[model samples]
Target: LRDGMLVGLGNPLLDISAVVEKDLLNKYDMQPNNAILAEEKHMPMYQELIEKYQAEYIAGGSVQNSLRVAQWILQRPRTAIFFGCVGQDEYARILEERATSNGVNVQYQRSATSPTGTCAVLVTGTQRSLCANLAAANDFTPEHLRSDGNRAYLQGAQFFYVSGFFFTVSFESALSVAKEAAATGRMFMMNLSAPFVPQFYKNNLEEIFPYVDVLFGNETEAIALAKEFNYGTEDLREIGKRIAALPKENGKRKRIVIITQGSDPVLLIEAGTDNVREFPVQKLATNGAGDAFVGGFLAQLLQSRTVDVCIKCGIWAAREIIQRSGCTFEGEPSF
Candidate 1:
């Protein structure tokens, strides 16, 4: 893959990750295995994790994590460029340092109005719950992305990625990138980042859905969208098929939908295809599995590998990441 071949947009959160007991989940009123935007009641959890548990900082956010993985597998610096808003604070500096060291170029829009964003990742056993306080991440505006330097980066990229979490930050920003990708016949990909995304931002998601050429999500997220859209069934493959068939603004390439089902094989469907292919996973941790999978998948994809090859590489990357904590890796990618 070439430098800046892929561009990713999302909330850039400094992940405050730690393993905690289940009682903490009750205190925050959060599910053991779920992702949510932080609320007023959940605000104290960040400090509590640091004060009470052995917490470590990991540069994260859905799309950022994916880009990191893609860079790792590709072993190519600056293969991906990230766009997000951050605060002019130490935390933002740390994020910039970490992401840059990982080879994912981050073009962060600084916000003096708010502090940097953070994701409180509580890992209890095999389950991981995320509570992100978007603070400065919510300050991202289309203007920053439209600036001459960044706009040129957008124009040069062959692939575009956006996270569903970004819908809450700026619909216009995501729409603008998606629209440009469609207009230029470049690939535009998006993920159903969390269940709350479809539940809360249904209109925004649907509004930009037509511009999406590729969609990624886990089984739970797929089921959530299925129910939210009244697809009338809980079958994952069926949901993939139905979602892939959704109307599109660009018809040059049929939409492709990939749904991950933990260790139970991933479902891949293409628009106008009756066949729903399933690829078995090698097995791994719950945290960052989805992100790593997409990372590996995109890495292989940029190399012009076939869909099946991409899925296998994705499985390999997830298996490697889940063996550790956080969205991190070491040594060369064996895959």
Candidate 2:
């Protein structure tokens, strides 16, 4: 309930990641490079991993993942605080323990009826598959955030990270945070999630763009934002230029836009300069790479580190997740 903390909001999920054979993925109709909603029949794929391939469960979802990594990098307890909805089940307990272990404080509303969300991260040779069930997270309402206690959570945080998926879940909830950030002179950041985000929630994301101080997303997601706003060119630099020009009044530095490309130079606009910063790395998996980058970037910037140092730390954190099995540390106890 204080300022200067890095506050985050979005769906929270229990990530079940494991290395499995391609056949198991085929059986579940899972593919690489994208996420799909898990059907009732696909639940068994996650169970099969625990029974055979030795799966891992940790607190996951874009915003939660970024906050966890940011806290870890900052080496500060309670520096990263998050708000979301969860079920009153074992999975919620697991998520709470994992996040606290990584120094992320949670302010959650419990849903007695719905179950905690789950995601199955299927790792094959090069393709990492994702099937998510956003059970209770989708139930998070703007009304919950309007509570006197919940509104306290919105106050004081200097940096706010809003996940792109939240727009699809509850745009009103996202806008509420944007308004808070705008009014209090706090910095607001947002990640562009999947490609469909623009096609489905164009107005939702674009509506809050002016309030965003820092924008995170990959080249593809950036292209969608560009085209959706009537930018004729598909060129990334041209897109970055236009996006960085969007108005932001945090009384801090000018707006920053980071566009990531796998193993390629990062296209960005910082301090009104268009440049491509390289973050060359060997990627073994791509599931949590983007999330880690955001976590590291926000963590360093919160410390007032130079933008160069921030982006470097972001890329460093990304490498940790890419070369590993899951987005987070495994074998951490929840009990």
Candidate 3:
């Protein structure tokens, strides 16, 4: 039996979030609800806004947040491993310190060419927008996989979680890591990070799904993936069936495909059964709620719980995260 829970294989990012005044939003020309790409010229404006408003910093990346949530609930060492590129500089050191403080084992690879990855978060009321400036993270390459001993680390873990955003910048490296993780005979999990990812990487998902054991997506992402597979606008049941029937190269049947509708019931399908579980989520702050759900679901799976139990855990976690301001709750809840 494995000694501890480990579930993560992706980048670590420092989230610089601030609640900006409505007037500053106009200066940046940022859309109220959408995440916009930030340019070099915008850095000065961003810094100016940071000085004007109260700011909060946290160590966050999709997978990193998942791992942190797991650690918060599990309260154990080595509950997660984060793999990604960072600089060997001070900013990277701060990230490592934060991860260690959270009891997340850091398996970071340093890049000489870049600084650490940072995401500028802009929050107005309950709405959140992200401007991700990869910087040093862009230097992540397939070669870092070998250097970081990721193959061995992946083989040692029981559950592996990957995010779709990794593919946005480093498609080859993400594919290489997923293939390696699947080869270890461990449960391979994936999240469709954003709505646009499945639309942009339709071909990549076709090739990668054969290796994915559990898949998670929101309603928009589910629709996008269904369309990619040419399954017209079928209902949830048909879409679930189509997803389960996809070919698997390793001969392992695809076990679960989950479609999470924000604050509504969730749709789940396994190899032999289909079930839709309803759990109402209160709308507080929806940022990071989905990732929180993923974290809770994986934690239950690691504990050898049943599928129904995992889904319930997911709902509970989502509810808690939405009640808070950030991706994770301020305090750990008794599970």
Candidate 4:
């Protein structure tokens, strides 16, 4: 058992993944390579996607996913804790059960009014479309975290991870937790989650930057956050560098920015050196690769592995995730 857990907060949506064609997208009027809010009537579309295409279900949403992968890596109970709201329904039970079985702790605030959110991961060969109906998941409050053996939770964590996805509901709470992390000298980290976060919520993202020692993002998010920093993204390495160099104050260590490019290079930048690492792998579904990557990265780094080794661990976890169906790996991971 670990002494202190790595804590994260975000919306937890159940992911239903499958591969489909262009006509399906046309029928739903969905755009490939994007995550849009699904209408209530899209419920049938989710059911059809699963029924017609032999889909797989897994616990999803950016931060919860990362923690699940991290929990798998640690192989230790109570290593991670996540906060999210779910409905008082069967889907909520599904989420709780999956999280427990995967060795992660969940602090769920049940919603009586809204149903648990669901995301449809529709992959068409190389391209994929993400349509999420975030119902109860979007409803969370600081009080949900600040009550019942949970009030001191963040204070007791060794590291804190937040997702930009929470900007939809817990943006202020995001900043509040970052401040808590900073004042306590704990490592604070956050994921860009999606490009729209940086493109639209740049100011809010900046507010949390000073408290974030480690930051994770993929190519597009790196590009978006770079523009916010008034920099160019022609070179992914440079983007990592500038982004890493942003925060004026880092409590315990030099800031770290990790950028992943699929099968190309994992760019890691800090003060003096820029490390570009590559992982070669076969592709199946790229749905949760980034989440798994971050999970593996955090698990190894928290275990005191070298940066190169941590990146390798992340790459390997992502390798396994992409070769599978949902945000899950097959059986037990040996990572």
CA lDDT of each candidate?
0.89, 0.79, 0.72, 0.81
For model 1, what is the C-alpha lDDT against the true structure? 0.89
Candidate 3 per-residue lDDT, tens place, 99-193, comes to 77766788777888887877777888877777766677667776655654666665567777888877765777666656765676667788887
Better of 1 and 4 by TM-score: 1
Per-prediction TM-score to the true structure, in the order listed: 0.96, 0.86, 0.85, 0.91
Worst 10 residues of 3 by lDDT: 276-285
Tell me the deviation in Å of residue 34 in model 1: 1.7
Rank by TM-score (best first): 1, 4, 2, 3
**What does candidate 1's lDDT look like per residue over 263-286, in tens digits?**
899889999999999998755435
Model 4 CA lDDT for position 183: 79
Q: Whose TM-score is higher: candidate 2's or candidate 4's? A: 4
C-alpha root-mean-square deviation, each candidate: 1.5, 4.0, 3.1, 2.5
Q: In candidate 1, what residue range of length 10 has the lowest lDDT sum? A: 324-333
Kindly report which residue pairs in candidate 3 clash with one another: none
The lDDT-based order of candidates, best leading, equals 1, 4, 2, 3
Which candidate comes out best when scored by lDDT?
A: 1
C-alpha lDDT of candidate 4 relative to the true structure? 0.81
Query: What is the per-residue lDDT of model 4 for residues 1-335, given as tens digits with 9 covering 90 to 100?
Result: 47347888888999988889999898898877877668866778888977898988867888888888888878886889988899999888888988877788888898899999989999997888888888898888888877857777776788888888888778888888888877777788888887778887888988788888888888878887878778845578778777777754654688888888777677777755666444544443377889899999889877888888888889888888877645354367776
